[PDB]
């Protein structure tokens, strides 16, 4: 629907770094407007397809840039969000890579550039590694140029390093996947002793294992993350990696709750309580390297939320299948971290559908990211393709050109307005009411048939999110079979808001309307009672009262 595709050269920008813009088209009588939280901070003539802007230098600030044509009113031509951050961890927008074979440099560039346009600021390299117990193939002095992975696919070192370089060139961090504790059947028993493993019983008979059939090479066997011999072994493995591949850090994965399992000596392995010492030991060994750890279905989250992790990560499973279950994870993560850490959700959309070639269900994907983004979360979902399954190379489902377009606007939006979405504040219930019957308004958690209003006091602003369940035919976020409805647009819906405190300005932004650029609304205020009209509600509208 946008006339123009507006992009920048990098995914994000440290303070003092220049932003280089490309537009695909030029139009006459147009203006580039730079906004910070809805306020114009610069305008200039739209003059060509390529120009630059040096952003203000305050750290951790999101901006929107919007090109307008003047009609003999103004029409939005297209938008881009910009993130000024010194470091990804405050506002993580996490993506993946999953294929590391003989892939050309231009093919790799097209992958990274596309991730760059979603402002992805870090990438989890998934199944890059040789083995869980030896991520580096070969030696530091003599690294193997080609190896085979857990599915016996070829991985090229030069593809790994090439993607690390390309990610770096776009201001993205590179995080190497491995398990915290994983060992395959070709490990060296001289190095990883019996004493190190986790067992299904007290008599060190049977080792705990995640069973994998063909074409996987091995079951994943399981060590004690608290075991210091294990820790020192794996620190050496990590160091080797770092000396060969210039990863910024270690994305620590695990298999989630193993139920009731045991150490060599018969004591409860209680793995959630073993992770803290593991994380500390990994950080201690490579103090310059970042750590993120997957609390699978929250297993370990409370125990690890206080440790040296850049931000928190949760892979979401049953029984956390409701929209209200994703916000419970986000609320619990804030509480476990004492409001220190934001969260990334791994939450694989259209999961059952992804048993076969097909399309992602656009409305299910968008409704999901609306809830996630609106509540200050982030979704790990984009790499070479979008995730349909926990096995990231699975690319059975494609994104329509419409979904691609739309999701770019959703990433623009959660970037531009990060300062409002996930940079402090308190959730409140706004006292709001339809003025014209056009909205059937409720609170959070949501109700099918209703628009849910979510309030956040963020410094001196009042934020109101409208999240549209009017046409929802389920409240399960995964939309596993791709059945979720596209919501009908609601237009020009009058809202009544109690707000004591003089209102100065009210503004609207939605990723569904005008590329998420701020629109100032008309309003009246009669003592406490404030009215105004929202232009368009489809999935997700944000109202901001200053």
Numbering used by the authors: 39 to 110, 113 to 586
Text from the published report:
Earlier, we identified dextranase (FjDex31A) and kojibiose hydrolase (FjGH65A) in the dextran utilization locus (FjDexUL) of a soil Bacteroidota Flavobacterium johnsoniae and hypothesized that FjDexUL is involved in the degradation of α-(1→2)-branched dextran. Collectively, FjDexUL proteins are suggested to be involved in the degradation of α-(1→2)- and α-(1→3)-branched dextrans.
FjGH66 is a member of the GH66 family, which contains dextranase and cycloisomaltooligosaccharide glucanotransferases (CITase). To elucidate the molecular mechanism of substrate recognition, the crystal structures of FjGH66 in an unliganded form and complexes with glucose, IG2, or IG3 were determined at 1.18 to 1.85 Å resolution. All crystals, except the IG3 complex, belong to the space group C2, and the space group of the IG3 complex is P212121. The overall structures are almost identical (root mean squared deviation of 0.304 < Cα ≤ 0.472 Å); therefore, the following descriptions are based primarily on IG3-complex structure at 1.18 Å resolution. The crystal structure of FjGH66 shows that some sugar-binding subsites can accommodate α-(1→2)- and α-(1→3)-branches. Enzymatic and structural analyses of FjGH66 revealed that FjGH66 accommodates α-(1→2)- or α-(1→3)-branches at all subsites except subsites −1 and −2.
